[PDB]
């Protein structure tokens, strides 16, 4: 059921957990560094888990898709063909920015955090900088121990702060991925849909130095030896069985103002969806003619598809459940309840009004802000502006550099500059700049930026062509050139005649002003948001209702039971899909083209000792009433005894609006069955060595 429960709520959900079917004690689950919870790691726009004492890690194919794409080329396309390393020496690096974060300690810092903020008095921007100074000090102290990375989280609008300390594994290698016709069977047609038939899994291996300490890639590094790892279920999963997931959901917005929902539904999601689809069409068209563009833009293209389709789905679900009306009625109730309290209700009412004022400030420039950020997110202008900002920041002492630009951030910045080599073609990027240029010209005069209007010298197709012809002169298209600029000082950027760099230098004062506006807004949110959210919480608690914080990229536990759902009168989705379902969708063309070995094994009924007698086949995917979101991809699904029964990977179509307004009847996790993983590694794209390592072969 509903609830992305933080570890600290475990006492509160131990009753419900046992009634749903958990046979482990909740005390065993409370031990976040023990068995099995200590096996769960963050990637961390995704989740994964160890499944071997020798550092083997399972996650989704969608999670490893960036890694797989980084190691693919047009001639040797691992996305299309799959990858299997027969020995550990055959494993390829997953890229310099691949990470596995293993949890080491959580600490509550609420008191000190609120003290730091309170100290700044009545000034909004000082409030933001005080919290930033606190966070940088706290993290620096925490990361004094080598090999560890720390993160400060805010929960329930600034009512609670906790610091997480993680061992940071820096050398992650690709060990196995199925062919993309299994890992992403059905492609974007099946994305966000049930019935699903997708074997969304892949394996990494974590490596550290011989000293045991984390190290960046090196042929002298050796497999990390996790304290705990998961084991496959020995009992078959069936309908109604207990399941639970622990993972790292990114964000939900269930506590938003009705006005914030209204703007997201009316402007944000349709705007983004549209921009994403425009860019998708262009790049699709270009890739059809050029196999190098196709492989190089594959990961970008997966994200644009996923997010655009998710937004279309949310807009549809909002209409399905009248979300706009449910937010308006619920807020009326909260605001009435507060007014019924005179004195002690006044601060939440004041807070409400301020959040509305801030929403209105943000709206005034929303088109300029979005369009600018996306324009500057193309590969050459993104690189130039990042590199030039770094050069500015390096002039300050480290403690005073903007987060993202401190010494601790250097490894990631540099890694991103190299990774872009596999994700960049100038001919494609020029069409993306052209699209964003044409969108900037349609903005009204009051949403324009002087520095961009000047750099353009006009408002017509000829100015656009000139700007593109000039940017074509940049040398930032080669990796070695981006890395030169990574080390160069401010003056050097300000002297250069590279047109991408000249663009950076000219817009940067403006970027810096917008950031101050965001920081000032965020400073007032820091005062108003905790106060309004405490009042929501107190209202829902007085209503009986569930109280848990919105997702914030920290570790959460959700639980429930395998079950389908009823999309309409006269029908039901069943909880499992089966091998014969995969074959029934076969067309022989992308995205319904399974490997031939899969088609043969199914036709010959080779079930590999993994058949569930209750469904007459080997299960493929299943539905359950768990509460997951973006960031839970790859999370392990554990049964009544803490054994691995699948991996979380998607939501059904009707579920996606639950980010704003939760609908119990139509919100289900979609997961890939562990037996399907095993089946593929037996009969389809064989990996006898990993099965034995795990050890189910």
């Amino acid at each position: 059921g509903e609830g992305m429960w933080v570890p600290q709520q475990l006492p509160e959900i131990a009753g419900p957990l046992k009634k749903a079917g958990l046979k482990l004690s909740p005390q065993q689950i409370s031990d976040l560094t023990g068995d099995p919870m200590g096996a769960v790691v963050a990637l961390g726009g995704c989740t994964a888990s160890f499944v071997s004492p020798n550092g083997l890690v399972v996650t989704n194919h969608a999670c490893a898709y960036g890694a797989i794409q980084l190691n693919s080329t047009a001639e040797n396309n691992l996305i299309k063909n799959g990858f299997n390393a027969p020995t550990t020496a055959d494993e390829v690096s997953a890229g310099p920015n691949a990470r596995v974060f293993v949890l080491d300690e959580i600490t509550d810092v609420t008191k000190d955090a609120k003290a730091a903020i309170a100290a700044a008095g009545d000034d909004a921007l000082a409030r933001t900088k005080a919290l930033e100074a606190f966070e940088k000090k706290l993290i620096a102290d925490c990361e004094a121990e080598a090999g560890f990375r720390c993160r400060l989280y805010s929960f329930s609008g600034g009512n609670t702060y906790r610091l997480f300390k993680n061992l940071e594994i820096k050398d992650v290698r690709l060990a196995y991925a199925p062919p993309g016709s299994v890992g992403k069977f059905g492609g974007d047609i099946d994305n966000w849909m049930w019935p699903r038939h997708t074997g969304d899994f892949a394996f990494y291996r974590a490596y550290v130095g011989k000293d045991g300490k984390p190290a960046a890639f090196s042929k002298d590094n050796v497999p990390y030896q996790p304290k705990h790892w998961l084991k496959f279920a020995d009992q078959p999963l069936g309908a109604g069985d207990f399941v639970m997931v622990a993972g790292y959901p990114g964000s939900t917005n269930r506590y938003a103002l009705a006005a914030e929902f209204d703007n997201t539904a009316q402007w944000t999601y349709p705007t983004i969806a549209r921009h994403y689809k425009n860019q998708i069409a262009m790049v699709e068209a270009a890739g059809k003619q050029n196999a190098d563009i196709q492989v190089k833009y594959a990961a970008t293209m997966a994200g644009w598809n996923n997010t655009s389709k998710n937004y279309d789905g949310q807009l549809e679900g909002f209409k399905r459940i009248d979300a706009a009306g449910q937010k308006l009625r619920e807020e009326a109730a909260v605001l009435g309840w507060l007014k019924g309290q005179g004195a002690k209700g006044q601060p939440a009412l004041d807070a409400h009004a301020k959040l509305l004022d801030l929403l209105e400030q943000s709206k005034a420039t929303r088109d300029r802000d979005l369009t600018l950020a996306l324009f500057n997110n193309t590969a050459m202008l993104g690189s130039a502006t990042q590199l030039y900002r770094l050069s500015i920041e390096r002039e300050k002492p480290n403690a005073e550099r903007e987060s993202g630009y401190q010494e601790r951030d250097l490894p990631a910045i540099e890694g991103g500059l190299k990774q872009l080599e596999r994700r960049y073609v100038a001919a494609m990027d020029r069409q993306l700049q052209e699209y964003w240029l044409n969108e900037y010209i349609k903005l009204p005069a009051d949403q324009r930026v002087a520095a961009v209007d000047a750099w353009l010298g006009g408002n017509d197709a000829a100015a656009v062509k000139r700007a593109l012809d000039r940017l074509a002169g940049t040398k930032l298209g080669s990796t070695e050139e981006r890395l030169k600029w990574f080390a160069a000082d401010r003056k050097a950027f300000e002297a250069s005649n590279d047109p991408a760099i000249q663009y950076a230098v000219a817009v940067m004062p403006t970027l810096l002003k917008l950031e101050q506006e965001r920081k000032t807004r965020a400073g007032e949110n820091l005062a108003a948001r905790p106060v309004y959210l405490q009042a929501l919480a107190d209202y829902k608690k007085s209503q009986g209702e569930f109280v848990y914080p919105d997702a914030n990229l920290s570790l959460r536990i959700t639980f429930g039971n395998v079950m389908g759902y009823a999309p309409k009168d006269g029908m039901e989705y069943t909880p499992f899909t089966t091998l014969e379902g995969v074959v029934a969708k076969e067309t022989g063309q992308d995205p319904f083209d399974s490997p031939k070995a899969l088609l043969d094994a199914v036709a010959a009924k080779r079930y590999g000792g993994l058949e569930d007698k209750r469904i007459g086949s080997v299960p493929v995917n299943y539905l359950s009433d768990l509460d997951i979101t973006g960031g839970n991809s790859g999370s392990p699904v554990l049964d009544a005894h803490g054994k691995l029964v699948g991996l979380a990977f998607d939501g059904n179509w009707e579920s996606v609006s639950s980010n704003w307004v939760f609908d119990p009847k139509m919100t289900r996790m979609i997961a890939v069955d562990g037996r399907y993983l095993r089946w593929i590694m037996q009969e389809v794209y064989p990996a006898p060595q990993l099965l034995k390592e795990m050890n189910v072969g």
Partner: peptide, 5 residues
């Protein structure tokens, strides 16, 4: 798929 947006 539930990767980060």
């Amino acid at each position: 798929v539930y990767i980060h947006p």
